[PDB]
C-alpha cells in the first residue's frame, strides 16, 4: 500500500517468488477440523495481587 504500481509489483513477484513449488508434496490436502465451545470456569486465587 502507498505509492506503488500494481504492474511493477507483479513483475517483482515473478522474479523473486516463482521458485516456490505450487503443488503440495505427495499432494495431501489440508482440511480444518472444527473446534467446539464448552461452558466452564477457571479460578486463579492470589490475594497478594
Amino acid at each position: 500500500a502507498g505509492g506503488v504500481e500494481h504492474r511493477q509489483l507483479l513483475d517483482l513477484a515473478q522474479k523473486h517468488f516463482s521458485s516456490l513449488s505450487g503443488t503440495y508434496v505427495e499432494d495431501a490436502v489440508p482440511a480444518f477440523t472444527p473446534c467446539r465451545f464448552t461452558g466452564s470456569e477457571i479460578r486463579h486465587r492470589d490475594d497478594a495481587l
Binding site: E41, I42, R45
Partner: protein, 71 residues
C-alpha cells in the same frame, strides 16, 4: 462475615464444568455399591458391639421374667 473478607489464600486453581454439559448418572451402581462397602467396613466395629450387648441383656431379661411364674 461476608465473602470477600473470610481468609487469605495464594496459588490454588479451580476447574469446573457447567451443569448442562454433564450427564446426570455417570456411574450409579458400579461405584455406588463398592464405595458403600468401604464406608460400612470402616464404621461396623465401632458401632455394632454396643448393640450386641443390648440384645444379650434383652434376651436374658425376658427369660427370667417368664420362669418366675409357673415352675
Amino acid at each position: 462475615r461476608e465473602f470477600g473478607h473470610l481468609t487469605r489464600m495464594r496459588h490454588v486453581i479451580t476447574y469446573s464444568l457447567s451443569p448442562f454439559e454433564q450427564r446426570a448418572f455417570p456411574h450409579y451402581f458400579t461405584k455406588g455399591i463398592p464405595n458403600v462397602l468401604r464406608r460400612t467396613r470402616a464404621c461396623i466395629l465401632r458401632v455394632a458391639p454396643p448393640f450386641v450387648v443390648f440384645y444379650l441383656v434383652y434376651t436374658w431379661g425376658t427369660q427370667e421374667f417368664e420362669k418366675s411364674k409357673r415352675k
